[PDB]
Amino acid sequence: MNIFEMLRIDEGLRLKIYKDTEGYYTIGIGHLLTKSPSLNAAKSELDKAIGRNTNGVITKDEAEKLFNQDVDAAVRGILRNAKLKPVYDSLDAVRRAAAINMVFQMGETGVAGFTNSLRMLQQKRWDEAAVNLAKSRWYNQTPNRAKRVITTFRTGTWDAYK
Ligand SMILES: CCc1ccccc1
Ligand SMILES: [Cl-]
Ligand SMILES: [Cl-]
């Protein structure tokens, strides 16, 4: 199992603009277009991202291409973050995917706001980190996805995704 497969399960795939769990215009595999309430602003952003006049609809290939760029960016964001990098480099491969998932979902600032959890993961105190991760708006808002990511950090296996 890998990051792409993991995120494809967590995010789904939609070829027409839709609103995410927070009510924000998104498309494809969890690609946020804009936080603005305007559908046009969203369509504008979409056309700018695809490089053509899409009219709110994209193909599967286009979706996958945004997806590759977004995963790439998430990882790169982690590596560039002084607070995140050290933790990320301390993790094994499976857990790294859990870290990428979080950043992809909520951005680097967001995650960078989980200080205590970061420290606990860095110390490899899995169960404790798992409990601390659960005390968050993230877990309360998207509990089933949070549980899957949390189990992944807790166990270091893909069991939650099987
Ligand atoms: C807090 C989860 C995490 C860990 C390392 C890097 C990014 C994100
Ligand atoms: Cl883009
Ligand atoms: Cl959920």
Listed by start position, the domains of the chain span 1-162
- Side-chain-facing half-sphere of 121: CA atoms under 13 Å: 30
Strands laid side by side in the 14-19 sheet:
14-19, 25-28, 31-34
Percent helix, strand, coil in the chain, to 5, is: 65, 10, 25
Q: Coil, strand or helix: which one is 1?
A: coil
For 38, list phi and psi in degrees, rounded to 5: -85, 120
- Side-chain-facing half-sphere of 30: CA atoms under 13 Å: 22
CA distances from 15 to 26, 55, 115, 131, 151 (A): 10, 11, 36, 36, 30
Q: Is 114 annotated as a binding residue?
A: no
- Method of elucidation: X-ray
Dist CA 7 CA 16 (whole Å)? 18
**Residues linked to residue 14 through DSSP beta bridges, in sequence order:** 28
Tokens 């069991």, located at residue: 159
**Active-site entry in 11, 45, 62, 108:** 11
Q: Which CATH class is domain 1-162?
A: mainly alpha
11 given a catalytic annotation: yes
Ligand located closest to 50 CA:
2
For 128, list phi and psi in degrees, rounded to 5: -65, -40
Q: Which of 126, 67, 136 is nearest to 100 (CA)?
A: 67
Tally of CB atoms within 10 A around 89:
11
Q: Is 132 annotated as a binding residue?
A: yes
Atom of ligand 1 nearest to the CA of 87: 5
Q: Which residues contact 97 (CB under 8 A, 6 or more apart)?
A: 2, 3, 6, 152
Give ion ligand 2 contacts, CB < 5 A: 49
Instruction: Ligand 1: list residues with CB < 6 Å.
Output: 78, 84, 87-88, 99, 102-103, 111, 114, 117-118, 121
Q: Which residues contact 71 (CB under 8 A, 6 or more apart)?
A: 3, 4, 7, 100, 104
Identify the H or E element spanning 88: helix 85-90
